[PDB]
C-alpha cells in the first residue's frame, strides 16, 4: 500500500481504526465523535509517513506540524499528543537516527538491562533516548546474543539469525535504511537430492510437495473443524495430527482396493451362476437332440402322434437353443466388465518408501522453521503468528547480521563478560548482582529503579537456576516459563577455496535415509559472495548432533556433498564452525515455539512486569520494578529478530511511562 | 467447511484410529487381511469358472437345427388340427409354442381355433388334463 496509508501498514497498524494501544492513550478520541477519530487517524498516519520517508534524522514535533496542513494543523495539542505517543512507544525515532535536539544534560531514573541482544539494545537506546541512565549487563564477550556472526579473513557467515523475513511492515526495513546492510534476495528454488546422490525427478518433487501441503491443511481441518485437540486428557501436537491424517489416507487406500476387488467377486460369481445355467442347459440340449434324432428316425408316413413328437422336440430344442444364446451375450458382457474392472485398479499404496522419505524432508524443513520436533508443536496454535507475516522477499545479510546490533550498541554503557547471577527487586528499588566470566570471584552490585530482563527463555527455564530471583517469580510467570517451548536448530559453516556448486541456486536439500534422521544436514545454503556453504541440522537431529565432534560432523557433510557433486569435485574446507545452541549456556536453545499445552496467551504472560510487595505492611502498592523483553515476550512476532527489537521498543515505552510519566493521556 | 480435495477424514474414522496406542496399526491390518481374504476368494472362483468354461467346449453347435422358412397359411388341414389338439395337451395356453409346432399357423389363428373348434375338439377337457401336470 501507498500514501499516508502505507505508513500505517509499514508500521503494523490499521490505517482506518484505532488500536487498543491508542484507545488507552486517547480515550477521549475513541469514545468521541467519528470525525475526530478520522482526524487523529490521519495525524498518526501522516507523522508515521514523515518518519518512514526519512528515518536517518529525528522527527521533531514541530518539524511534524510544519508539514501537517489544515484542517489537521489546527489542533496543536492533538498533534503534540500524537507525536509524543508515537515517539514514546518507538513507532518513530527508533534505531539509529541523527538527533536534532541533543540530550538532556541530566538523566532521570536508572535502569539495568540484563542481556545486550537485540531486544536489550533496542530498549537501551530508547531509554537513553528518553532521558534515562541505562546500563547493560552481558554475559558474553560480544553484543547481539543470538545474532552471532562468524568472521575469519574474508569468510563471513551468520551462526544465528540470518534472514530478514520480508520488508513489508518489518521494522528491520527502517533499520536497513539507518544502518547500511547488504540485503540480498533468496531464490526459493530448492532441488532435493536423495541419499543415493541424485536429484528427485520433477514428477515427484511436485507430487510430494503438494502432498505435504495437503497433509498440513488436513491437520488444520482436524483442529478447527472436528475439535481434535485432546487425546487421553493430553493436548494434541502437530506431529500426532499429521500421523493420524497419514494413517487415514493409508486406510482409505485399503478401503478402495477392498470395494474394488469386491466388485470383481460380485461379478465373478454372477458369472459362476451363469456358467452353471449353461452347463445344465447344454446337457439338456445334448439330450433333446438325441430324442429328436430318434423320433426323426421313425420313417414316414407315420401316425399323427409320431409327427407331433418330431414337431414338438424341434420346437423344444430351438427354445432351449434360443435361451442358451441369450445366456451367451450375457456371458460376453460379464467377461468384458471383468477385463475392464481388472485393468482399472486403484492406487496400490498411499506413499512409497521413496515417497515417504521425500515427505520427511518437507517435515524436516518444517522442524527447521519452528526449531523443534513436530511432536512438540501445539496443533491448535503452532501457526498463530502466521496472520502477521510480512510481505515481500526473504533476504540475507551479505556483511553478517552482527552489524545490526554492533551498530545499536554505539553510544551505550555495556558491561561485557558480566554474568548476572541474582536479581533483587523490592518496593524501593532493585539490585542486580553479577560476576566476571573470566574469574567468577570478582563480584559486582548494580542498583537501579528498574531491571529489564531479556534473558533467553532457555536461561529462564534452566533447572537449577542460572539466575535467582529475590523474591522468586510468582507461579503465573514460572508456569508460563515451563509451558512454553524453547527449540533448537544448529548450523555447520563450510568454508571452501572455490565454488563447486550451482551458483544460481541459493539452497538445495538432502533427503534422509530414515525418519529419525530427517533433519540431519537436510539442507544447504549458498548465499555469500564467497565460497561458503551452510548445512542445517533440524528436528530431533539437532540435539543429538551436539554430542558428536566437529570433525565427524564436517565429515558427514563432505560425504553428502561428495555424492551430490562427485567425489573429486569437493575439496577439504579451509575453515569449519559447528554451532551448539542448546549447549550455549547464555542461550540454552535457539528460539521459542508454541508448545503443545501452551498458547499465545503464555507470551503475554511472559511480557507482564512484576510488582514487588510493600516493604512495610500497610504501605501503598508499589510501582512495577522487574520488566521482561525478548523474542518469547512478543506473541504476534515471536522467535525472530524483528520481534525481539519490537519488544525492546515496547518495554522502553512502558518503563518511560512508569518512571518519566505519560503527559499525553489528558 | 470441508477437508482438502484428495484427503479423506471422517469424525467416525478418526476416533477408531485413536482408541489406543496400536488401534491405528490394528485397523490397518484388519483391512490388509480382509484384502488377501478377497483376493484368494477371486483366484478360487476364477479357477472354478475356468473349469465350467471348459465343459462348454464348441458351444451348442452340433445340436442346432436349421430353421424352416414357411409362409403362413389360413386353411386348417385335418393334419394341422390334430397337431394342435396335441400341442394344447402339452403346452396349455402357450400360443407362441403351439404356433411354432404347427409351423404355418401364426399366433392369432391359434387364438381363433381355441374358439371355433372349442366344442368339437373338446378343448376345455384338454386344458384341465394339462392343468394337472
Curated annotation (Swiss-Prot), chain A:
Q: Name the consequence of residue 365 to A.
A: Strongly reduces demethylase activity
SWIRM domain residues: 4-103
Q: What EC number(s) is this enzyme filed under? A: 1.14.99.66
UniProt-annotated stretches for the region Demethylase activity: 130-666
Q: Which residues does the record list as N6-acetyllysine (modified residue)?
A: 262-263, 266
- Could you say which residues bind FAD here? 119, 138, 140, 146, 162-163, 631, 640-641
> What is the top EC class of this enzyme, as a single word?
oxidoreductase
| Residues annotated with Phosphoserine modification | 441
Task: Report the PTM annotation.
Answer: Acetylated by KAT8 in epithelial but not in mesenchymal cells, thereby regulating the epithelial-to-mesenchymal transition. Acetylation by KAT8 reduces KDM1A association with nucleosomes, thereby decreasing histone H3 demethylation, leading to transcription activatio of target genes.
Positions bearing the Glycyl lysine isopeptide (Lys-Gly) (interchain with G-Cter in SUMO2) cross-link: 272, 299
GO aspect biological process, one term = protein modification process
- From the UniProt record, which GO molecular function terms apply? chromatin binding; DNA-binding transcription factor binding; enzyme binding; FAD-dependent H3K4me/H3K4me3 demethylase activity; flavin adenine dinucleotide binding; histone demethylase activity; histone H3K4 demethylase activity; histone H3K9 demethylase activity
Note the coiled coil stretches, chain numbering.
258-344
Q: Which cysteines are joined by disulfide bonds?
A: none
Altering residue 333 to R: what's the impact? Loss of polyubiquitination
- Residue(s) of cross-link: Glycyl lysine isopeptide (Lys-Gly) (interchain with G-Cter in ubiquitin): 333
Q: What is the effect of changing residue 394 to A?
A: Strongly reduces demethylase activity
Which GO cellular component term is one of those annotated?
Answer: chromosome, telomeric region
Q: Where in the cell is it found?
A: Nucleus; Chromosome
The domain-related comment in the record is:
The SWIRM domain may act as an anchor site for a histone tail.
Q: How does it assemble?
A: Component of a histone demethylase complex with RCOR1. Component of a RCOR/GFI/KDM1A/HDAC complex. Interacts directly with GFI1 and GFI1B. Interacts with INSM1 (via N-terminus). Component of a BHC histone deacetylase complex that contains HDAC1, HDAC2, HMG20B, KDM1A, RCOR1 and PHF21A. The BHC complex may also contain ZMYM2, ZNF217, ZMYM3, GSE1 and GTF2I. In the complex, RCOR1/CoREST strongly enhances the demethylase activity and protects it from the proteasome while PHF21A/BHC80 inhibits the demethylase activity. Interacts with the androgen receptor (AR).
Cited function = Histone demethylase that can demethylate both 'Lys-4' (H3K4me) and 'Lys-9' (H3K9me) of histone H3, thereby acting as a coactivator or a corepressor, depending on the context. Acts by oxidizing the substrate by FAD to generate the corresponding imine that is subsequently hydrolyzed. Acts as a corepressor by mediating demethylation of H3K4me, a specific tag for epigenetic transcriptional activation. Demethylates both mono- (H3K4me1) and di-methylated (H3K4me2) H3K4me. May play a role in the repression of neuronal genes.
* Protein family according to the UniProt entry: Belongs to the flavin monoamine oxidase family.
| Disease in which the protein is involved | Cleft palate, psychomotor retardation, and distinctive facial features: A syndrome characterized by cleft palate, developmental delay, psychomotor retardation, and facial dysmorphic features including a prominent forehead, slightly arched eyebrows, elongated palpebral fissures, a wide nasal bridge, thin lips, and widely spaced teeth. Cleft palate is a congenital fissure of the soft and/or hard palate, due to faulty fusion.
Q: What is this protein called?
A: Lysine-specific histone demethylase 1A
Q: Which gene encodes it?
A: KDM1A
From Swiss-Prot, chain B:
Q: Which GO terms describe its cellular component?
A: DNA repair complex; histone deacetylase complex; histone methyltransferase complex; nucleoplasm; nucleus; transcription regulator complex; transcription repressor complex
Q: Where are the coiled-coil regions? A: 24-59
UniProt-annotated stretches for the region Interaction with KDM1A? 1-74
Which GO MF term does the entry hold, naming one? enzyme binding
Expression by tissue, per the entry, reads: Ubiquitously expressed.
Keywords, comma-separated and alphabetical: Chromatin regulator, Coiled coil, Host-virus interaction, Isopeptide bond, Nucleus, Phosphoprotein, Repeat, Repressor, Transcription, Transcription regulation, Ubl conjugation
Location of the protein in the cell: Nucleus
Q: Which family does it belong to?
A: Belongs to the CoREST family.
Question: What's said on domains?
Answer: The SANT domains may bridge the nucleosomal substrates and the demethylase KDM1A.
Q: Assembly state and interactors?
A: Interacts directly with GFI1 and GFI1B in a RCOR/GFI/KDM1A/HDAC complex. Interacts with INMS1. Component of a BHC histone deacetylase complex that contains HDAC1, HDAC2, HMG20B/BRAF35, KDM1A, RCOR1/CoREST and PHF21A/BHC80. The BHC complex may also contain ZMYM2, ZNF217, ZMYM3, GSE1 and GTF2I. Interacts with REST. Interacts with the SMARCE1/BAF57, suggesting that the BHC complex may recruit the ATP-dependent chromatin-remodeling SWI-SNF complex. Interacts with SOX2.
Instruction: Name the job this protein performs.
Output: Essential component of the BHC complex, a corepressor complex that represses transcription of neuron-specific genes in non-neuronal cells. The BHC complex is recruited at RE1/NRSE sites by REST and acts by deacetylating and demethylating specific sites on histones, thereby acting as a chromatin modifier. In the BHC complex, it serves as a molecular beacon for the recruitment of molecular machinery, including MeCP2 and SUV39H1, that imposes silencing across a chromosomal interval.
Task: State what protein this is by name.
Answer: REST corepressor 1
Which species is listed as the source?
A: Homo sapiens (Human)
Instruction: Please state which portion of the whole protein this structure contains, as first and last residue out of the total length.
Output: 311 to 443 of 485
Amino acid at each position: 500500500p501507498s500514501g499516508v496509508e502505507g505508513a500505517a501498514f509499514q508500521s503494523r497498524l490499521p490505517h482506518d481504526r484505532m488500536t487498543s494501544q491508542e484507545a488507552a492513550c486517547f480515550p477521549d478520541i475513541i469514545s468521541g465523535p467519528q470525525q475526530t477519530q478520522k482526524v487523529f487517524l490521519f495525524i498518526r498516519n501522516r507523522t508515521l509517513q514523515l518518519w518512514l520517508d526519512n528515518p536517518k534524522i529525528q522527527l521533531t514535533f514541530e518539524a511534524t506540524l510544519q508539514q501537517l496542513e489544515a484542517p489537521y494543523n489546527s489542533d496543536t495539542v492533538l498533534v503534540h499528543r500524537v507525536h509524543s505517543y508515537l515517539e514514546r512507544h518507538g513507532l518513530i525515532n527508533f534505531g539509529i537516527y541523527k538527533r536534532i535536539k541533543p540530550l538532556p544534560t541530566k538523566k532521570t531514573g536508572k535502569v539495568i538491562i540484563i542481556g545486550s541482544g537485540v531486544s536489550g539494545l533496542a530498549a537501551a537506546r530508547q531509554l537513553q533516548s528518553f532521558g534515562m541512565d541505562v546500563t547493560l549487563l552481558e554475559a558474553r564477550d560480544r553484543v547481539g546474543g543470538r545474532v552471532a556472526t562468524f568472521r575469519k579473513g574474508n569468510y563471513v557467515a551468520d551462526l544465528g539469525a540470518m534472514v530478514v523475513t520480508g520488508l513489508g511492515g518489518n521494522p528491520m526495513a527502517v533499520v536497513s535504511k539507518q544502518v547500511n546492510m547488504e540485503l540480498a534476495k533468496i531464490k526459493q528454488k530448492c532441488p532435493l537430492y536423495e541419499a543415493n546422490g541424485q536429484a528427485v525427478p520433477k514428477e515427484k518433487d511436485e507430487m510430494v510437495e503438494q502432498e505435504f501441503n495437503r497433509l498440513l491443511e488436513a491437520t488444520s481441518y482436524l483442529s478447527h473443524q472436528l475439535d481434535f485437540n485432546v487425546l487421553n486428557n493430553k493436548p494434541v501436537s502437530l506431529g500426532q495430527a499429521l500421523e493420524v491424517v497419514i494413517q487415514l489416507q493409508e486406510k482409505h487406500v485399503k478401503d478402495e482396493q477392498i470395494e474394488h476387488w469386491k466388485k470383481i467377486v460380485k461379478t465373478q460369481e454372477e458369472l459362476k451362476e451363469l456358467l452353471n445355467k449353461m452347463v445344465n442347459l447344454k446337457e439338456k440340449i445334448k439330450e433333446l437332440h438325441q430324442q429328436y434324432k430318434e423320433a426323426s428316425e421313425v420313417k414316414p408316413p407315420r401316425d399323427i402322434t409320431a409327427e407331433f413328437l418330431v414337431k414338438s422336440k424341434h420346437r423344444d430344442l430351438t427354445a432351449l437353443c434360443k435361451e442358451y444364446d441369450e445366456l451367451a451375450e450375457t456371458q460376453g458382457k460379464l467377461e468384458e466388465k471383468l477385463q475392464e474392472l481388472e485393468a482399472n485398479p486403484p492406487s496400490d499404496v498411499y506413499l512409497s518408501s521413496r515417497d515417504r522419505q521425500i515427505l520427511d524432508w518437507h517435515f524436516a524443513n518444517l522442524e527447521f522453521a519452528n526449531a523443534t520436533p513436530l511432536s512438540t508443536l501445539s496443533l491448535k496454535h503452532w501457526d498463530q503468528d502466521d496472520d502477521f507475516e510480512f510481505t515481500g522477499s526473504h533476504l540475507t545479510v551479505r556483511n553478517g547480521y552482527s552489524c545490526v546490533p554492533v551498530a545499536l550498541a554505539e553510544g551505550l554503557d555495556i558491561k561485557l563478560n558480566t554474568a548476572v547471577r541474582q536479581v533483587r527487586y523490592t518496593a524501593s528499588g532493585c539490585e542486580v548482582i553479577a560476576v566476571n566470566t573470566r574469574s567468577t570471584s570478582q563480584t559486582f552490585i548494580y542498583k537501579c529503579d528498574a531491571v529489564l530482563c531479556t534473558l533467553p527463555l532457555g536461561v529462564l527455564k534452566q533447572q537449577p537456576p542460572a539466575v535467582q530471583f529475590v523474591p522468586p517469580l510468582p507461579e503465573w510467570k514460572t508456569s508460563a516459563v515451563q509451558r512454553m517451548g524453547f527449540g533448537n536448530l544448529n548450523k555447520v559453516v563450510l568454508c571452501f577455496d572455490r565454488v563447486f556448486w550451482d551458483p544460481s541456486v541459493n539452497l538445495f536439500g538432502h533427503v534422509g535415509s530414515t525418519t529419525a534422521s530427517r533433519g540431519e544436514l537436510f539442507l544447504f545454503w549458498n548465499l555469500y559472495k564467497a565460497p561458503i556453504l551452510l548445512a542445517l541440522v533440524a528436528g530431533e537431529a539437532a540435539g543429538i548432533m551436539e554430542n558428536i565432534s566437529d570433525d565427524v560432523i564436517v565429515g558427514r557433510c563432505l560425504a553428502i556433498l561428495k555424492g551430490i557433486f562427485g567425489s573429486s569435485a569437493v575439496p577439504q574446507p579451509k575453515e569449519t564452525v559447528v554451532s551448539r545452541w542448546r549447549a550455549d549456556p547464555w542461550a540454552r536453545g535457539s528460539y521459542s515455539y508454541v508448545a503443545a499445552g501452551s498458547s499465545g496467551n503464555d507470551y503475554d504472560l511472559m511480557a507482564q512486569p512484576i510488582t514487588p510487595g510493600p516493604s512495610i505492611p500497610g504501605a501503598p502498592q508499589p510501582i512495577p520494578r522487574l520488566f521482561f523483553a525478548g523474542e518469547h515476550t512478543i506473541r504476534n512476532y515471536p522467535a525472530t529478530v524483528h520481534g525481539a527489537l519490537l519488544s525492546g521498543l515496547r518495554e522502553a515505552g512502558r518503563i518511560a511511562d512508569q518512571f518519566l510519566g505519560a503527559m499525553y493521556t489528558l | 467447511r470441508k477437508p482438502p480435495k484428495g484427503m479423506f477424514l471422517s469424525q467416525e474414522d478418526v476416533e477408531a484410529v485413536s482408541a489406543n496406542a496400536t488401534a491405528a496399526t490394528t485397523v490397518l491390518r484388519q483391512l490388509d487381511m480382509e484384502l488377501v481374504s478377497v483376493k484368494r476368494q477371486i483366484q478360487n472362483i476364477k479357477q472354478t469358472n475356468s473349469a465350467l468354461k471348459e465343459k462348454l467346449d464348441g458351444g451348442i453347435e452340433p445340436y442346432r437345427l436349421p430353421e424352416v422358412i414357411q409362409k403362413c397359411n389360413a386353411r386348417w388341414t385335418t393334419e394341422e388340427q390334430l397337431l394342435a389338439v396335441q400341442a394344447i395337451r402339452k403346452y396349455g395356453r402357450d400360443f407362441q409354442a403351439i404356433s411354432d409346432v404347427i409351423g404355418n399357423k401364426s399366433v392369432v389363428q391359434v387364438k381363433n381355433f381355441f374358439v371355433n373348434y372349442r366344442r368339437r375338439f373338446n378343448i376345455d377337457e384338454v386344458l384341465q388334463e394339462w392343468e394337472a401336470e
